[PDB]
Ligand SMILES: Nc1ncnc2c1ncn2[C@@H]1O[C@H](COP(=O)(O)OP(=O)(O)O)[C@@H](O)[C@H]1O
């Protein structure tokens with residue numbers, strides 16, 4: 186009769202809700218803001234920190250910090266503030282009545298998961314908790330059990346190949362290029378238009394620019410060439426102040442970092458080439474099913490036209506005798522949440538939590554021999 | 558824009574009911590900017606602002622009563638900050654109404670608009686401290702001092718929020 | 726590809742009949758990918774997936790009923806494994822249909838294809854647990870507990886398989 190709580194603590198958007206549901210009830214950016222000015226009024230000077238949407242509304246007077254950068258957690262005193270805002274202030278449930286399910290990118294440091302379950306037990310007193318891999322839940326949300334997962338969140342971009350039940354942990358390819366690096370490259374590439382976005386409160390504005398304008402070209406060279414004859418690729422976006430900005434080739438040079446990471450100096454391969462590189466790390470028998478089942482979770486795979494370029498860029502690398510199907514579900518931004526609503530509400534799961542009586546005798550090291 | 562936040566019932570019996578009174582008097586106060594409510598001149602807006610000032614002082618009293626028994630920082634500092642905000646807003650509204658009344662009886666739309674903006678900030682502060690007092694009460698219900706005030710989590714009429722749209 | 730596996734009659738009377746219902750609703754469901762059956766929009770695919778989810782939950786119930794009286798590991802562990810597979814598939818289909826319905830009523834072919842693949846995996850799991858339940862029932866027919874369920878080997882309509890081709 187009790188329900189389970191699920192909380193995808195992403196790098197840019199904390200999503201949370203109840204198990205068995207079909208949509209997250211709370212979604213808010215995981216920002217902690219400190220005020221940085223004097224505060225001359227005698228009231229409204231005691232509020233020392235702001236979290237979530239009330240920091241997103243007041244971002245002009247706050248230094249903004251994400252506690253999660255590239256999947257790992259660098260500030261625990263802000264992460265417990267964000268979780269305390271998540272459970273009480275927006276979900277309005279007590280943690281002691283519901284078991285909780287958290288989300289972790291693969292190949293993370295063990296100290297991150299250890300301090301995460303220690304904070305979840307010895308501060309909020311949950312009955313039971315479970316941390317799951319951020320990519321294995323995307324296959325639950327897609328309805329499948331085979332396929333490789335290209336989860337490109339805000340912090341990290343990881344490819345996990347999973348045949349029917351069984352993952353292949355020697356082929357989990359985690360690349361540190363994601364939406365925050367595209368946001369910083371859009372800050373760097375909008376300087377050539379004349380616009381200077383320097384503070385951390387303008388990162389939100391250029392993130393909104395990336396939201397509503399940036400698409401990815403099917404072919405990059407000729408689309409770059411037609412931007413020289415600047416006639417139809419410019420687009421105007423209105424700022425919060427009122428000034429309009431015009432954007433030309435910067436509209437599609439920003440997602441092209443996903444397929445050419447040498448633009449920001451990263452010695453790596455693009456997300457089309459590490460996918461074929463990661464399928465080739467697998468065995469030759471399951472390679473047919475992994476080529477034909479390519480799910481894409483994460484918000485950074487919500488650019489207009491990333492499925493077409495992903496298919497076109499794999500099919501020049503794969504052998505040309507069997508098809509590639511980049512299956513891109515339309516709700517994929519919340520996809521990591523949706524599988525979290527499945528696995529927590531599944532009937533055969535309830536003897537695979539981490540109970541509090543199992544934690545206090547074995548310490549926080551119980552989370553490694555239970556989850557992965 | 559707190560009518561979507563003011564989804565409650567007549568329960569709570571000390572905090573929620575005056576919050577609903579302040580919400581309906583804001584909803585009838587800011588209708589004067591559209592000009593189709595029961596407010597005609599400017600002096601009834603002064604009486605309305607005096608009503609919200611007295612109700613905000615009473616809410617400040619009740620918020621001070623709940624804040625004595627909260628043990629430490631985690632929500633008590635937030636509650637004290639919103640209490641200082643609602644105290645500043647109500648005390649500014651109180652003797653900002655007086656100067657507008659004395660301007661009225663010694664000699665015409667923006668005069669209402671300043672009190673409207675003050676009431677809007679007061680209402681945002683009061684729904685913020687309603688949320689903070691809910692968190693502070695249902696966080697520490699086993700703690701001693703909270704149990705004597707007799708405010709269980711059932712008495713608050715806060716439901717779970719809406720399903721967020723997955724697409725668009 | 727279980728039509729060659731679904732060579733039965735209307736006997737069995739608890740397990741085989743809903744298996745044939747699930748087989749014919751898969752055969753009408755995956756015809757929508759060819760697009761010449763009685764399925765036109767995507768919402769009837771949602772109702773079909775809800776039908777197979779309810780039938781898979783009923784099959785999980787019956788499989789749990791037969792699995793109590795099987796004595797030890799040899800087929801009971803296989804039956805429990807396929808029961809956990811069919812439980813995962815049906816529960817994933819159940820609330821994967823809801824998000825596709827809410828995407829449908831808030832704003833178009835791959836949306837069907839994900840549920841098609843989930844139903845295909847569900848059907849493979851259900852024919853696997855039909856075979857495992859047949860083995861577990863006709864293995865231990867003299868054992869106590871099996872005889873009360875009243876499922877003899879004659880009631881199953883599994884014939885011997887085809888002659889394998891000797892050449893080519
Ligand atoms: N349609 C879109 N276009 C561009 N960027 C997007 C889009 N949708 C989401 N994003 C980016 O992806 C992020 C969404 O959060 P996400 O990274 O998916 O959460 P998580 O950290 O759990 O993966 C946002 O910060 C935003 O920058």
Ligand SMILES: [Mg+2]
Pocket residue numbers: 194195196197338339340341
């Ligand atoms: Mg993430």
